[PDB]
Amino acid sequence: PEFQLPHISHTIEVPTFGKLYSILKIQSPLFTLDANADIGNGTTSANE
Amino acid sequence: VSQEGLKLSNDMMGSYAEMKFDHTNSLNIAGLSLDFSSKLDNIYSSDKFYKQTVNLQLQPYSLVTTLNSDLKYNALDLTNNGKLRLEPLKLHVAGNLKGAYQNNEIKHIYAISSAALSASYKADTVAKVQGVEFSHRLNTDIAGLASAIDMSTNYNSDSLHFSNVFRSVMAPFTMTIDAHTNGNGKLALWGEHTGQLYSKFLLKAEPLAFTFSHDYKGSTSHHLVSRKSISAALEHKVSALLTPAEQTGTWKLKTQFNNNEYSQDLDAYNTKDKIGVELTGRTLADLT
Amino acid sequence: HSINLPFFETLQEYFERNRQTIIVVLENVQRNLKHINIDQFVRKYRAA
Amino acid sequence: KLNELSFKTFIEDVNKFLDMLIKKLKSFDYHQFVDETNDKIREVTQRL
């Protein structure tokens, strides 16, 4: 692959967080487990 | 002793029964040159003797040196040779070495040169003992600075054929690796064992972009006594992309033991938008 | 996200002021040199 | 140069030069470099 570098400005480049999930699923006729863990940050507004 | 130069010649003979000694020297001075010759001959028996030829020639801007010796003993032989051409701004070394005994003969080839401030080396070693050969090849272009290397070892036998080919260049900026190993074991001691070997490693290294491909194919069957046919199959591929733009990697460990097979699909992901991995374990187990 | 802080622009305007002053000083020096051309130096050297 | 020298412009020029240098290093050809060295040594030999 070719090299990629975002440009550098006098400002600060901090990408905002998206959302985090933990998809887990277990397939066995003895027991089936399909629990899930999900979490994210409020991106409705910068102040909140 | 004269104004032209020194002359020295010493000849000692000796003979009795079977052991006969014939030794002579040749030492003269001609202006700025030396003509050396010591013909040393030690004949003890017909197949049991020794020879030595030491001859030195001195001249400006050059060197002549001849070194050949002979040695035998009935069923045993050992011979060697050497060429030394040392000259300004260059180098030229060659010769021969060979040791043979009855059936098993070992032959070696060597030659050392240097020109344009670049070293040159090449070695060949051929071993043939009890019908088992050993073809190990080392290629030339061995200089030291931005040079290359290439090794070729070949093993052939009635129970194992081995073959590996390696080729790599240690360039200052880029870097390459070529590994290709193939083997096949044929063992019959207490059951049949097919030691089949499949190996391949490749790698390309360069600044801010690293990558590598490894593929392995290990399958070996064990046909023992009392229908103990054991099939061992281990197949994995190693791959990952290493660059600041993106980081990732894939690894598929595929193995099986007779009726019990396991697979794992291991993949790594790391980009500026997301990062994470995936797990998938499939197990097939028998019994109760 | 582009995080920006007032110290960034404070430094930027200080740097702008400094560059303006240095350009002014350089122009002053260049004008002073062009005022006394090399011919005057040559004539003074010959007189000495 | 002083008038054109700005923090944003200077960092942009630095990023440009590093990017082009990395691009040249990635596409760095051994035989091209060897021929370039041969050409330069021959040029120096002819000059001397």
Side-chain angles (χ1 to χ4, degrees):
Chain A
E2 301 291 335
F3 182 78
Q4 179 184 182
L5 176 61
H7 176 67
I8 297 174
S9 179
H10 63 277
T11 58
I12 297 179
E13 290 78 12
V14 173
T16 60
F17 163 68
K19 182 262 181 177
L20 176 59
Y21 56 97
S22 179
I23 297 182
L24 61 85
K25 62 186 78 63
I26 297 84
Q27 292 76 16
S28 60
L30 311 180
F31 181 87
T32 307
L33 183 63
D34 44 353
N36 182 24
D38 308 326
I39 190 179
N41 176 25
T43 60
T44 299
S45 180
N47 183 85
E48 301 190 358
Chain B
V1 182
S2 180
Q3 307 293 330
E4 182 269 350
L6 176 60
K7 178 52 189 176
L8 176 61
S9 178
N10 302 328
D11 309 332
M12 183 278 288
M13 295 299 103
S15 184
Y16 189 83
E18 304 175 1
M19 291 55 68
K20 56 192 63 62
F21 292 165
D22 305 327
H23 309 270
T24 181
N25 286 15
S26 302
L27 287 77
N28 184 24
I29 301 306
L32 296 174
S33 61
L34 169 60
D35 47 354
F36 176 78
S37 179
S38 60
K39 298 182 179 59
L40 312 183
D41 301 328
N42 302 88
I43 301 306
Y44 310 93
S45 179
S46 302
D47 305 329
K48 179 180 181 179
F49 65 96
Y50 183 75
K51 298 186 52 53
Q52 182 68 36
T53 64
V54 184
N55 304 321
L56 276 296
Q57 310 302 330
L58 303 189
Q59 61 279 353
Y61 303 92
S62 176
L63 176 56
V64 174
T65 304
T66 299
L67 309 177
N68 303 327
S69 181
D70 304 329
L71 178 57
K72 300 184 182 301
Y73 177 82
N74 299 269
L76 178 58
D77 201 333
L78 173 58
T79 181
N80 57 5
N81 300 118
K83 182 265 287 179
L84 180 53
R85 298 295 89 79
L86 183 63
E87 300 183 0
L89 304 180
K90 61 188 62 58
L91 174 60
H92 310 272
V93 176
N96 178 23
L97 175 57
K98 180 188 56 54
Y101 176 80
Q102 300 180 180
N103 57 359
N104 305 329
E105 176 184 0
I106 297 178
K107 183 59 186 64
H108 179 268
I109 297 172
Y110 57 95
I112 297 89
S113 181
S114 179
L117 299 179
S118 180
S120 176
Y121 179 78
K122 180 178 179 300
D124 305 325
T125 301
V126 180
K128 299 181 180 181
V129 178
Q130 299 293 329
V132 179
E133 70 87 16
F134 189 74
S135 180
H136 172 54
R137 304 284 76 81
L138 174 58
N139 295 155
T140 319
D141 191 7
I142 297 172
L145 197 148
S147 179
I149 193 59
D150 195 326
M151 182 295 308
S152 178
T153 300
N154 307 328
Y155 179 83
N156 307 337
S157 64
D158 306 330
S159 60
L160 174 59
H161 167 60
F162 181 77
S163 178
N164 47 7
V165 179
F166 185 79
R167 177 56 179 177
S168 180
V169 182
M170 61 305 298
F173 290 159
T174 61
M175 187 66 204
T176 179
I177 297 180
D178 300 328
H180 307 75
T181 296
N182 305 325
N184 178 23
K186 295 303 181 182
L187 189 137
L189 296 180
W190 191 255
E192 177 62 28
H193 304 67
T194 302
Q196 188 61 36
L197 180 55
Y198 292 165
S199 177
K200 176 191 60 182
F201 177 78
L202 304 178
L203 189 142
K204 308 299 179 180
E206 61 178 2
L208 295 186
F210 188 83
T211 177
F212 62 97
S213 176
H214 170 72
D215 188 5
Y216 172 70
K217 284 77 59 182
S219 182
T220 299
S221 299
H222 309 268
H223 299 354
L224 303 183
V225 188
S226 71
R227 81 285 182 277
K228 293 302 186 305
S229 180
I230 297 177
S231 179
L234 174 58
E235 295 76 15
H236 182 57
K237 303 179 56 57
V238 187
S239 299
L241 270 295
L242 294 174
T243 185
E246 50 85 19
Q247 304 178 0
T248 180
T250 58
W251 307 277
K252 306 307 177 181
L253 177 58
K254 308 308 174 182
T255 176
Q256 179 184 0
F257 182 82
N258 302 333
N259 309 330
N260 306 270
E261 178 183 0
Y262 182 80
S263 61
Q264 179 65 213
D265 292 331
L266 180 56
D267 301 328
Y269 299 93
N270 181 24
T271 58
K272 300 179 299 181
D273 63 331
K274 64 179 180 303
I275 190 192
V277 297
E278 301 76 8
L279 283 81
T280 301
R282 178 192 56 83
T283 309
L284 300 185
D286 299 5
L287 304 179
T288 58
Chain C
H1 188 51
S2 183
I3 297 181
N4 191 24
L5 306 178
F7 185 87
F8 291 154
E9 293 83 3
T10 306
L11 173 63
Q12 289 289 344
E13 53 86 14
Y14 282 164
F15 180 79
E16 181 180 2
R17 291 175 53 186
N18 302 332
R19 175 185 60 179
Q20 292 167 0
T21 53
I22 297 177
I23 297 179
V24 164
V25 170
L26 290 188
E27 292 172 1
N28 195 332
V29 171
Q30 184 179 187
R31 288 187 298 266
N32 187 26
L33 178 61
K34 292 183 177 180
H35 177 63
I36 297 175
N37 195 23
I38 193 60
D39 67 334
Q40 195 274 342
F41 299 103
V42 173
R43 274 52 169 172
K44 182 60 180 300
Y45 193 76
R46 293 191 298 102
Chain D
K1 291 298 181 179
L2 175 59
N3 185 27
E4 296 296 328
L5 181 59
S6 176
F7 180 86
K8 172 71 178 179
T9 70
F10 182 78
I11 193 59
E12 182 174 359
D13 173 69
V14 167
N15 189 88
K16 186 265 304 178
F17 189 82
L18 67 86
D19 186 72
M20 61 79 71
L21 184 58
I22 301 302
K23 263 60 180 181
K24 180 177 57 182
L25 287 182
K26 289 178 62 62
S27 61
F28 179 79
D29 188 11
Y30 186 85
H31 182 74
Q32 175 269 345
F33 180 79
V34 168
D35 301 332
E36 179 182 359
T37 53
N38 297 133
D39 166 70
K40 294 299 299 179
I41 301 298
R42 293 175 180 181
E43 174 186 2
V44 172
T45 304
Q46 180 64 31
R47 289 176 56 183
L48 66 90

